[PDB]
Amino acid sequence: TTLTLSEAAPLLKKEFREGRLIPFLGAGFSKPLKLPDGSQLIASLAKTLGFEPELFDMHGRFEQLAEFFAISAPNRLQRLVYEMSLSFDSAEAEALREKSPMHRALAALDWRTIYTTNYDKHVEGALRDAGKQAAVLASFADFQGPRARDVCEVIKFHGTLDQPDTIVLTESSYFQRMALDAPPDQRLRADLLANSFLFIGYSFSDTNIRYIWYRMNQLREQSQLGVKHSQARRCFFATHGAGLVQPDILQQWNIDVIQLDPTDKSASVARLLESIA
Amino acid sequence: TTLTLSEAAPLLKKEFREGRLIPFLGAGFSKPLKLPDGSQLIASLAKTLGFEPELFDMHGRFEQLAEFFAISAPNRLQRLVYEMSLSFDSAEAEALREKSPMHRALAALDWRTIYTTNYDKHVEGALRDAGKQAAVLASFADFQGPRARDVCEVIKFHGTLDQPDTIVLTESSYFQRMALDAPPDQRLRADLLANSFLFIGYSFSDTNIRYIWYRMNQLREQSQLGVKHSQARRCFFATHGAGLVQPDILQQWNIDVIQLDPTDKSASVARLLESIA
Amino acid sequence: TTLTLSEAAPLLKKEFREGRLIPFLGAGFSKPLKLPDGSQLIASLAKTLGFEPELFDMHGRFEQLAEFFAISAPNRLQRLVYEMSLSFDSAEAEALREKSPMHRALAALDWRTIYTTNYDKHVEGALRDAGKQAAVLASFADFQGPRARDVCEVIKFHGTLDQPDTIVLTESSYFQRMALDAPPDQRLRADLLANSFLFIGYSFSDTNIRYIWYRMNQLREQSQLGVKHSQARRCFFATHGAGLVQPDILQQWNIDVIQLDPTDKSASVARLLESIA
Amino acid sequence: TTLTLSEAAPLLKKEFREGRLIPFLGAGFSKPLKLPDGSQLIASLAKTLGFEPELFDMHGRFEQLAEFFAISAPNRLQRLVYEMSLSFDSAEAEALREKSPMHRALAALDWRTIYTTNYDKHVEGALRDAGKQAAVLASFADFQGPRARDVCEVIKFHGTLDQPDTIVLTESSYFQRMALDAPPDQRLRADLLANSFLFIGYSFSDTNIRYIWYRMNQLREQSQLGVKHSQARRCFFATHGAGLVQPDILQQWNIDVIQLDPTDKSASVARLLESIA
Amino acid sequence: TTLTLSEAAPLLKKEFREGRLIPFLGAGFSKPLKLPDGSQLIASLAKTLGFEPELFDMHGRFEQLAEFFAISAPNRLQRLVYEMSLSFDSAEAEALREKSPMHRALAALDWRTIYTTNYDKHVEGALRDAGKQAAVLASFADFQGPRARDVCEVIKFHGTLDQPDTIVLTESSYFQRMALDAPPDQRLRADLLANSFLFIGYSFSDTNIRYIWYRMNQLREQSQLGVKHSQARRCFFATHGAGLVQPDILQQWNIDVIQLDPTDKSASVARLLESIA
Amino acid sequence: TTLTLSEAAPLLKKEFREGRLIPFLGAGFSKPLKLPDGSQLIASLAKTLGFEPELFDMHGRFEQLAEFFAISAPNRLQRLVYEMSLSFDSAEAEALREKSPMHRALAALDWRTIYTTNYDKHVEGALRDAGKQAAVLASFADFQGPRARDVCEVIKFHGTLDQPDTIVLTESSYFQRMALDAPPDQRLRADLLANSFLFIGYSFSDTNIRYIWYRMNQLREQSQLGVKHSQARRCFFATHGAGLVQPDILQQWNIDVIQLDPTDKSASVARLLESIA
Amino acid sequence: APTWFYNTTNSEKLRELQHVLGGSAKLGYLTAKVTEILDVDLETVIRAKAIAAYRAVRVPVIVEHGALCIDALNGLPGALVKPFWESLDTRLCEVIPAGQRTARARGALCYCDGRERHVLIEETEGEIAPSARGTGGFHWDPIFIPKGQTRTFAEMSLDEKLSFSPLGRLHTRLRTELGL
């Protein structure tokens, strides 16, 4: 009911040599850089507001606690972006990034499009470390700006720290992305029409990501394809610790789960990215 | 920062005598009828699937555990509707409903529209107990069907048990309502343009209810009203146990919180509905 | 107020050598193949219905007269597609297509994406004549189907005759495309975020094409770019006979008009496509 | 014609024990923290634009070269603030700041108001290092925000990096401050009515600072005080390398020059701040 | 729509214990000292000019009738100041000032800044009666003069009788203060950035006071704060007899009205100043 | 990115025949009369003060070195005006002015208003040479003085040598003009509301000229005109040697650059003024 | 109107560059006088000469500086050739020992558009003559004999001198990179 690493490796080679495999990188991909995930941010927002971090967690979800933070005082969200920029993109996080085996194995492949939902320059920065060049696309001005001819386009799906208007963190910013009208939303839905995705270090907790894969099946089911042909183009979900409910929800959306070895999280991902080559 | 019962009582009389107050009733309004809330359903779905009810709860949210239930076997969702109908609308739940002080105090007022998100005939059934007559509107055929002239229209916002296609319980049914295209969605957004609402026994956990009040502020903020005039038409949220984060999120959406006495939940609601008269 | 051919030629070379120029081909591009335009179809639909072709034209627009045709009798639209197949993709239209100077000049360039709104295999057929290979993408199954690695993707925006469910001709099919949810709609809006377009043989009479360029400016104006930077990425509209109103409407949408010589329509287009090389 | 360190020391003790001495700190005060001054920023802006740093300097003044940078591309100023945040407020600039003798000698005194024109947290950060607490005031929301009772207010006169809308760097932002209507402008002109200032590490090159001291003399000369009484309240300008023209311009504005020893710039400033105690 | 005395008392205690409450005293504060208000001056100017006091009132406003008085003859304004000094600061007005309950309740609090618009030494004289010491600041030479360390600064906003050049009474002197360039104007606009004010005995009839609160909202509205945060810092307007139009004009400028009991004007003010303690 | 002479010639004919073109003449317009520019004055001020002219230049800007000159001794500025009058308006500068091709081509056109920033009678003197009559307006008494009916008004924007109080040369005189309250300032800002200007021989180095064009865009941007209509009324900047930064700063202010041939400066200007006719 | 301007005060360099790049309508001519820095390296002096000539004329400018590195003087003069021919006119043939007369005639163009400085360097091997011979040309042309040739730059005509001199290879590189 779940692919292993050796089973999923010839399936990922076929989609990569056809140029139809696109990585989707989450907050767990920057975990070996000693960065906060979605839980250590809330522990830092609770310290500023005067909450204990265990009491602040039980008043709402991740989107709702950041919405409460941003309206506590004026200019409270601007300060967070400034603090995150100094902590996420620091020089000691740069130094952990050249010697990271996941970021080396990611940049060794010749991708054309990479999607990320984290606010750090460590995915395009991994491509600059390997001598390659990348193109960060986050806002409308980036898509219409000049690029080079054949350069890997890194789509910052949730925003970048050097453009603080593009960061979606609060609940009102997730509701603004439910219209699927932002330039990262329109680019994602067109790439999903034709490409397989590889989710690495990401857990489907964002209700706007799950809503995009929902509405791709409304195109898939209305097109009245067979049992054989509607199940042909799959997406892949590499996860150490998926539960018992979530892999069966995603089978509806043509998403297969690749079970990685949970003893060493960083080496299991790196062996997956080296098996694509 | 929070209205009491005596403070909110003249504010609710003014909107009621103008005919611009509409109740919005949740799952906590049927709690004195000994019915399950959103947690005792999941305890019953876990027993059918072979889960322990505490282990089944930590694999996903309420929408996602019901999506996992409905795809476990064919005809598994239809069985749930049949079971719910026998338990929610049973004869002993009818007998607890005439002697309930909340349902008597609700039907004593001369409403014109009532919205509910629960699957039971105990809101229109409370109106039949007081000699009044109601009109259940759940699907497209109900809105175009014949009614009488001046009859309280009960809008089953999430569906009714006698029309099992209208019940939204699983995650795919909540995503289908994100388009705001269903007949209860279109009727709600037009009533929200002109009326104050009174949330009784409901907690804002549905991401499609919160998205409707989100997009009413996008009309409110784009209309460029003043500080005084954009804050004039309020909605009211009667809750015994609102936390510390959620009342400040809803102040954005012109929703005021009415703090009820948490020692006796049923008598606190009944004194609120009697203060409107 | 309008570019000439020699003025627009260095502007089209710059966007082509960067790989950011995409042709958009209309019904006037298949006019030297002796095919009907949008007016000779209505003259053929009026003959079947028993109308005089001048009396049938004054009862509605092009979308509405085809809607009236399709509901006159059962299977009346299926017959039209069969008839169009016989006359648009006939062998004598193939023979006029190798010796056409526009189709030779189009296929001489190394495009990557071509959009068309006409129902004929004469744009991808022009690429097969030059030894190149093309990939027709019209429906959801085409986007998820297998292609080769670097092949010009011809996006049949309004449908193809070999897939009669994809043809949008009647008014109800244009209203179904107003949601911008079809796979050619989603691919167009993502290519418009990053690329210049060249409209050849097309007149903006489709209210779903004009609505896509409308909503790209709602992204452009909300992004609050300057006067200089919001006017940088232009689109180009080659037309022999644009009026006095329509070029000023399209200046709002960053669409520049290239005035071609109206004495010989086919040679003026061919000199434009040869100036890009 | 110029005060020495021992001559100016009893003049600074008298104004400090009366509570009427306010420091004004410039870009040279953060020079021992290895930060750029106004010339190494322009060397960094020229590298991004593709200029040689000596050729870029001869096309305009400091305000005008930053205005040219900010309009070269969209979101070009936002990136600069992000980069400056990473380099000005880095952890190695924090570590040089505790062992800096100027920042220790500044925080040893019990000031009430400090003005700075540099975008870094190293003046209020020096007060946090000495156990004291500071209050950064940069925007309108900071002045109306809550503070404590007796806390040194650090007025970021040109803006702060955690509030990027307050940074005045380009020429258009200096012209917007010529109206003297910003909250740091209004607070400065009222403190100048009653207090002596001590300029440390600042050179009068900003035409809005010089315009404020200009218009204080228009109040001083119109009040028709004597020769003795109009020259009583002085301001002090500690500078290693003032030229031959600028000290005589500032004598008009009751600004006296304190000549510091130019062999060691950091130790000369530290002996001045220790002589006030 | 209007605060009472008991409602406004905890709001004034909070701003006073933080040191952010500043009294603003008008001509009605010296009414129990049997002094003229703005109407009995005009009755005295009409007697000198040979007018009947009811006929002189209908030829212009208060500013314009004093402008007509000052240009009737040479040295006519100097005489008025001399006469006002003998009447306003007489010994029998001193004797009514120690036994006045408002002036005792004002001096019992430990203020730091007091603004007045009346020409009499009865606000700083009330502080000398309570053993405290005050510092009158009216002209440019007063702001740069020597004071003590922690002494309540009484800002004579419209001038003092012992410095007759500072008195603004005529229309030309109000127009000279429209530039907001005088030393009491610059000190007021900087204190308004950070402090709540309490208007006692003053009615907003001066078009230069109303223009200062106008231009503080132009800073407040351009800073784009929320509905919640732009309404946080309020000012207070204690008045027995405010009409129906003026309290709603001042709600724009964050000025709340405290309704005092109009039966005894002196005792209502004294109970307000004792409730702050 | 820069107009040539033949491109800008039909644009200047259209504004001239409508009477909406006004010349703005700088110090380079009197360069063929062998007069000092802004650098040879400073070489003459350094000789009087005892400086070497290369050492005097590096102690401040042009405004600041003249401020240092004027306060070196009493009556030192009066002597400069006397010396400038004898040198600028000498008889041999008159004789070079009739045979100058620029001054003949300027006076051949029928202007109505001419602005100059140089202290010499060679712009109105050029009009007297062509038989026309001019009206010099420099001070308040000139604007209210008698003129003839239709006579070209020459606005001496920085002053005239026969009225030495109007000359702005020192830094304190430039700061006095920052209020934009002088009669040449008020006349310029009203002519800029309705007319195109032609800058000949002037380089934007005066921070009060640049501040006037700054605040015309604050009227232009607040009026919320479109992209098309806010860019309609242009100003023109004829310059042989504009750099790489300054033409892009002035595009913000609707100022277009006309590149003249730098081999012969006098003949390039004369061909521009003859192309307007 | 021209878009590039060749700046020289030497009227003999002007007629050489107008002999080949003269018909180009995109090239103008200016005569501003600049001051060179004190360094023997040709690359350092020509790069500091363009920044000092752009500051004078404020248009896209092309400057030219040469070198006459000599093996017997360990590379002297280098870019210091301007004050040698002023001081040692034909005694420069005598201060160098007979038997090791080899030298390099280097020459450099640097064009500055206001943002970037690009240096083009060509170079001609040769040897100093035993005595000055020839009348044509200008400074140090009677003393330099190119490799293979027996004659000096002064003995050859302007067409023949530019088939050996560094400027004859710098015409084509300046025309191609600037589109003249």
Ligand SMILES: O=c1nc[nH]c2c1ncn2[C@H]1C[C@H](O)[C@@H](COP(=O)(O)OP(=O)(O)OP(=O)(O)O)O1
């Ligand atoms: O190809 C050449 N063939 C013969 N003589 C040459 C050549 N190239 C430079 N020379 C001479 C000329 C000058 O005496 C010295 C270079 O010094 P140099 O600074 O470039 O001459 P310059 O100051 O008079 O004119 P410019 O303003 O263009 O620098 O060596």
Ligand SMILES: [Zn+2]
């Ligand atoms: Zn030279």
